[PDB]
Amino acid sequence: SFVEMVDNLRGKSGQGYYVEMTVGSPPQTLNILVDTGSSNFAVGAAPHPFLHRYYQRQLSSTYRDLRKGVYVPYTQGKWEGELGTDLVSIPHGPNVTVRANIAAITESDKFFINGSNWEGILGLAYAEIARPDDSLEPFFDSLVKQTHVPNLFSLQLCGAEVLASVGGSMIIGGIDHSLYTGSLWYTPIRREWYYEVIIVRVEINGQDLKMDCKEYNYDKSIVDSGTTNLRLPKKVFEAAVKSIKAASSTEKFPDGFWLGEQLVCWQAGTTPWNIFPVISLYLMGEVTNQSFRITILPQQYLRPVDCYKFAISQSSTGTVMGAVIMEGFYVVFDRARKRIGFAVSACHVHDEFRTAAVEGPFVTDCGYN
Numbered sequence: 001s002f003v004e005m006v007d008n009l010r011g012k013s014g015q016g017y018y019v020e021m022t023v024g025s026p027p028q029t030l031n032i033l034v035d036t037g038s039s040n041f042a043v044g045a046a047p048h049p050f051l052h053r054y055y056q057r058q059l060s061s062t063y064r065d066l067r068k069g070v071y072v073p074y075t076q077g078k079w080e081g082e083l084g085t086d087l088v089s090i091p092h093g094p095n096v097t098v099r100a101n102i103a104a105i106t107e108s109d110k111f112f113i114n115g116s117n118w119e120g121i122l123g124l125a126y127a128e129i130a131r132p133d134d135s136l137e138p139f140f141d142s143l144v145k146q147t148h149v150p151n152l153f154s155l156q157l158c159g160a161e162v163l164a165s166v167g168g169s170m171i172i173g174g175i176d177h178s179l180y181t182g183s184l185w186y187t188p189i190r191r192e193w194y195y196e197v198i199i200v201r202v203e204i205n206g207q208d209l210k211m212d213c214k215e216y217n218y219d220k221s222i223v224d225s226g227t228t229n230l231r232l233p234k235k236v237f238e239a240a241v242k243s244i245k246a247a248s249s250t251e252k253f254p255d256g257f258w259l260g261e262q263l264v265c266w267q268a269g270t271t272p273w274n275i276f277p278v279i280s281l282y283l284m285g286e287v288t289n290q291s292f293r294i295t296i297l298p299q300q301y302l303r304p305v306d307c308y309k310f311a312i313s314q315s316s317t318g319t320v321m322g323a324v325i326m327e328g329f330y331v332v333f334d335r336a337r338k339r340i341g342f343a344v345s346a347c348h349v350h351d352e353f354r355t356a357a358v359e360g361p362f363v364t365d366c367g368y369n
């Protein structure tokens with residue numbers, strides 16, 4: 001039952017959310033980043049300065065070598081490992097054990113994070129973007145094929161001298177109605193690689209950015225629990241920042257802040273949330289000319305570091321709806337029906353004049369790549 005999966009996620013602000021897993025026999029306990037933006041189950045499997053524990057294949061009686069290496073250079077860094085399979089469970093998840101592919105990371109650069117408290121990544125996206133190629137079955141595919149767990153999972157990410165601690169829930173194989181209020185609205189998964197969606201309109205304090213919607217999805221828009229910020233294509237970013245600056249003009253900030261590098265501080269409970277506007281993303285609906293909107297507050301896009309960082313930033317690889325977006329909502333990754341549902345989260349942070357919202361329908365191609 002889903003009650004035992006509630007609060008099964010933990011994290012530090014800006015360093016992702018992780019779920020506890022065990023790998024091998026006897027079971028080796030590891031904290032694993034829940035990542036909808038990649039498709040490899042990849043776990044530290046050798047000593048590293050930021051790892052205080054790692055996967056030791058030699059200690060597992062059930063480990064099987066696939067006799068194949070994997071090398072994954074990526075923009076910000078890289079990881080490299082060796083492929084194999086082993087038994088995998090999620091203690092506070094479905095009561096099942098599955099044989100899954102595991103990339104045992106032997107070498108990496110700027111991949112692991114100092115103090116994050118996770119030792120690997122659970123890529124929940126689709127085979128198309130798996131490394132080295134799409135023949136390496138992702139964890140969730142193996143889980144569904146090997147067990148009777150329904151082809152669906154949902155994420156409630158709650159957020160918040162030491163980085164603030166965050167919590168949330170990953171409900172595997174269904175939807176926990178206690179985790180949200182109001183209605184669930186669904187946007188189609190445009191293609192099964194990333195969790196790609198289409199944004200058809202963007203509003204800052206009710207004011208339409210009035211861009212050709214192709215810009216919003218140039219060259220794609222994805223939902224990514226493995227990204228902290230709301231990331232926007234350059235032209236949309238600039239337009240968004242312009243509008244946000246204007247709405248909050250009363251107070252004045254350094255452009256280092258708007259560039260998401262500098263933090264700004266008020267002291268304990270004086271933060272002027274009301275001076276910052278709400279942001280609405282309209283997502284394509286299940287019905288052609290129909291859309292719905294998710295609206296987030298400054299409490300979501302200014303993330304605590306008294307002090308905050310502007311968690312909206314520029315992207316050259318399309319829109320990324322990261323934690324900043326997801327923390328307002330209960331997000332259903334309905335793989336079986338090729339759609340992503342959004343509803344107001346029971347845990348989303350807000351005040352007594354505003355609240356995050358999911359609302360539809362609104363009547364309204366925008367697909368780019």
Ligand SMILES: CN1C(=O)[C@@](c2ccncc2)(c2cccc(-c3cc(F)ccc3F)c2)N=C1N
Nearest residue numbers: 014015016035037038074111224225226227228
């Ligand atoms: C964009 N993106 C990545 O770059 C990657 C990844 C996955 C697999 N292969 C290459 C890159 C990743 C790797 C490591 C850490 C983090 C990370 C996650 C957080 F939530 C916060 C801070 C972090 F640094 C993210 N996952 C995703 N979605």
